[PDB]
Design a binder for these strands. Structure first.
Lengths: 55, 87, 324, 177
RNA sequence: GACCCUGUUGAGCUUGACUCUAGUUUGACAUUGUGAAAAGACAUAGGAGGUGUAGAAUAGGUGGGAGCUUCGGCGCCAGUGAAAUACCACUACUCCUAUUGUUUUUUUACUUAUUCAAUGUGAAGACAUUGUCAGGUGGGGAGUUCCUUUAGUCCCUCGAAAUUUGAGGCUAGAGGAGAAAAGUUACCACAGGGAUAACUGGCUUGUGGCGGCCAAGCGUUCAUAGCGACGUCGCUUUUUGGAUGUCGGCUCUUCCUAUCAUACCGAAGCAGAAUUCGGUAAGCGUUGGAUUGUUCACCCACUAAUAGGGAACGUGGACCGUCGUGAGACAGGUUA
């Protein structure tokens, strides 16, 4: 945001936006495996029996 | 305020390792001596970088702390500042 | 085992093997471990008041008003204070801008405190790279007398002169000379101050390079250079004066090759020197003999300062009086 | 390694009398007989004692850098200048003194010209372009300069107006570090 | 406008020859004495030494030596220590006492040194004082027209260092009208000159950069003069969950879809319900409050839902100057 605020040209904004979106893309690319693990735990915790310990 | 960068991504031509290291100072910007004096970081600009973390051993079995590194990207195009170390 | 401890310390802390051997010789394993933890631990920052311009309670009140947390540095130093936190930068505050104080270390306190400059006296400082020592001599003598300041380098020289004019010493002549050349060129000073360049093993928090950037070659050349430095200082000093004049040697090195050995050499070479009690309250006794090398038993009065014992930079002092 | 010459010390005393009053007191004999004498090295002038000059002349011209207190340097056109290094003597023998507040002194230490809201109290009978010395509230010498106008015009002028043309201040010292 | 140049001005950096010397100057010496008071260091005679560390221990140190052994105390062994201990021999220093004295220095008093008054004898008083050299400086005066960068000799000298280095000498690679002021800068203010009349118009979007590995092909002659996509590896990037300046505000028409909802289906541990993603789809409709300079974010209230945009971004000062140049001002004008 600061870089774009001090941007001076259309190509400047071009490459700045491309670079930022690339950073987020690479971050998710590394986050590839936690998403799979959390999807699996979500599926089971959904298909988990629900008891009442107090009753 | 924001446009300065404190550390640079230095790639070592030998040992094939890239590490983030602090910037010591700016020595020569070939585009403009005025940019050199101010400290402008353009493409191909040699700066002094602390390489204590790398731990390269020099002659007499001695270690080095500060070495030349050529900024080799266009930081205005891509904010991240990247240099190749000179060894 | 000794070798196992050496390897473990070198691996875990990054010290060179040879310097680690010297430090292990210097301190027992408990004291050694405390010393290494201390010297990787950052030192506190102190502020020295400009007695010529203002006084301690007024400066403290001003910095409290501006939000700086202060504490007096022991009973020993009246002119000093210690900084905990400061909302306003210390550089930009009006007191520092006007010259009410300076930033420094307690090791910068100790040597000029050992010295006792008086009014209308002739003084020398062949190493005043920050300029705090010259400024504090000026503050002690109340801008009465003459100060000569000698430097090797234009850069720290201009830093020196900036500090001097900011603190308003008004009676110092600043020069770029050789410290060895100074006595023959002028000589005849009532008091002389030597902050000899050393290995810097005392303060690796300020100089992390010394953790490794010290080889045996440096450990050999540096003591020879400071030996010639003390030769120059003792040549400069005056034996007889209306006000007693003394030589002060201060260094920031902890290794024995730098400490007590060169002063033993100077004492052996020139009988005119005696050593007197340097007058410093907290310190450690000088070693009578370290590595098969007998030193004059009078070195008992010599003081040492360690980061682990006291929250001060590793520092070394010596005070001498000239007969003829 | 020279003393000043005729026109050189003429311009020097011209500036020094535009800014001070008792240049007799500056160049007057002392009790011991030693005198404060103008020195100039590398086209830069210094104020030293005669004994200091005598004991310093033993040094080679190139190796010696500073002597006494630097007063100023002469430009290529020959115009003489007095600096913040020469500030203390100027404050000691000031003719007109102008005192500023803290909120105005901070821009003054930065390098900004004096504004009317900055000054605390005024000197009287000040000529329009006469030199003056700028102090803070604590009578600490901050700088020197030529006033834009006289005291009465400053009184009747807008608070936002420029008061003194800010020549030199404490900035030079930390500039070099 | 950016931008280039010119002159002035500042900010600088550097040069401003060589040899003596005035101005100088640092240290010593002598002049310079007599006493008294002291102190220090060298003469000696003696007493006692000795821890940074660990080792049992407060380890001068060196040479022999494995128990003289009075006793096996302890040698030996053994740790632990740079150094190991018994012994008998050696010599260094100190901490001192004393005097068996020599010197040195400070202070005091006095005149005998020195210097003044008087001037053809008096006084200050060992303070000043003068002269002697060993230095350094020197743009001032006079006169004429080597140093800088690098490596070796590791040779000689001076040092240091328990034996190897440091600083000079030596050698050989490259450099070079004078005090009046100068050279020069992608720099500053000022005044001026020069140059562009101004921007985009098959431009815009969703996937970063640097380096390496791999890589079909092409290439100077062949995947190696080399160019070279997709991927992967290293850095950003990891072991415990506020940004926003002038603006807006409302309504209305029309259009696009890059679709919030309605309709339709494809996929999902989609039991049901409630959902998520994907696409066909513009007929339909698409509300507030807080907060703020003000918007969005976030926050909460309704509601099927509160989606994004376009409509030539749809309709209702600068000089003439005058007074200042280390910085500015002007109820001055010409006025567009």
């Amino acid at each position: 945001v600061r870089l774009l605020k001090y941007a001076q040209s259309l190509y400047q904004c071009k490459q700045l936006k491309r670079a930022a979106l690339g950073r987020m893309a690479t971050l998710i690319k590394r986050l590839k495996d936690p998403l799979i693990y959390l999807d699996q735990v979500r599926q089971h915790l959904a298909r988990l029996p629900d008891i009442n310990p107090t009753t | 305020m924001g446009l300065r960068y404190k550390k640079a991504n230095v790639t070592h031509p030998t040992l094939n390792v890239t590490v983030q290291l602090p910037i010591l100072s700016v020595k020569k910007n070939p585009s403009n001596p005025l940019y050199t004096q101010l400290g402008v970081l353009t493409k191909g600009t040699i700066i002094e970088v602390n390489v204590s973390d790398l731990g390269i051993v020099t002659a007499s079995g001695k270690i080095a702390w500060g070495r030349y590194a050529q900024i080799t990207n266009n930081p205005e195009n891509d904010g991240c500042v990247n240099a190749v170390l000179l060894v | 085992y000794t070798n196992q401890l050496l390897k473990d310390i070198c691996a875990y802390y990054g010290y060179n093997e040879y310097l680690a051997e010297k430090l292990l010789n210097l301190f027992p394993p408990r004291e050694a471990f405390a010393f290494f933890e201390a010297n990787e631990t950052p030192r506190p920052v102190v502020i020295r008041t400009n007695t010529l311009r203002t006084h301690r309670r007024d400066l403290a009140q001003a910095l409290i008003n501006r939000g700086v947390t202060l504490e007096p540095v022991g009973k020993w130093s009246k002119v000093g204070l210690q900084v905990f936190d400061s909302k306003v930068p210390l550089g930009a505050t009006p007191e520092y801008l006007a010259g009410h104080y300076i930033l420094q270390a307690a090791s910068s306190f100790l040597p000029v405190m050992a010295l006792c400059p008086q009014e209308n006296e002739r003084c020398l400082d062949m190493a005043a790279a920050p300029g705090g020592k010259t400024t504090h001599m000026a503050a002690l003598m109340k801008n009465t007398g003459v100060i000569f300041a000698n430097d090797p380098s234009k850069s720290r020289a201009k830093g020196l002169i900036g500090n001097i004019h900011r603190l308003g010493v008004r009676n110092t002549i600043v020069c770029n000379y050789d410290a060895r050349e100074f006595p023959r060129v002028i000589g005849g000073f009532d008091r002389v101050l030597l902050d000899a360049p050393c290995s810097g093993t005392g303060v690796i928090c300020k100089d992390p390079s010394v953790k490794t950037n010290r080889d045996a070659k440096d450990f050999m050349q540096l003591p020879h250079t400071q030996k010639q430095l003390l030769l120059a200082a003792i040549d400069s000093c005056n034996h007889a004066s209306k006000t007693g004049g003394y030589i002060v040697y201060s260094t920031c090195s902890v290794c024995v090759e730098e400490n007590e050995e060169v002063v033993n050499y100077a004492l052996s070479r020139r009988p005119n020197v005696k050593l007197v009690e340097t007058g410093l309250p907290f310190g450690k006794e000088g070693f009578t003999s370290y590595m098969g090398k007998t030193f004059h038993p009078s070195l008992k009065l010599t003081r040492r300062f360690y980061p682990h014992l006291y929250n001060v930079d590793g520092f070394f002092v010596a005070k001498f009086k000239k007969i003829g | 390694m020279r003393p000043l010459t005729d026109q050189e010390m003429k311009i020097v005393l011209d500036k020094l009398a535009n800014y001070m009053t008792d240049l007799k007191s500056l160049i007057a004999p002392l009790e011991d007989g030693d005198r404060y004498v103008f020195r100039m090295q590398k086209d830069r002038v210094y104020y030293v004692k005669l004994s200091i000059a005598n004991i310093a002349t033993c040094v080679a011209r190139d190796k010696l850098l500073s002597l006494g207190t630097c007063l100023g340097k002469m430009t290529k056109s020959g115009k003489f200048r007095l600096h913040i290094t020469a500030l203390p003597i100027l404050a000691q023998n000031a003719r007109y003194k102008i005192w500023v507040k803290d909120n105005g002194a901070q821009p003054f230490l930065y390098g900004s010209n004096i504004v009317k809201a900055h000054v605390g109290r005024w000197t009287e009978d000040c000529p329009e372009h006469s030199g003056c010395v700028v102090y803070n509230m604590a009578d600490i010498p901050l700088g020197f300069g030529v006033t834009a106008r006289s005291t009465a015009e400053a009184r009747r002028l807008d608070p936002t107006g420029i008061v003194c043309f800010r020549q030199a201040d404490c900035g030079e010292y930390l500039r070099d570090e």
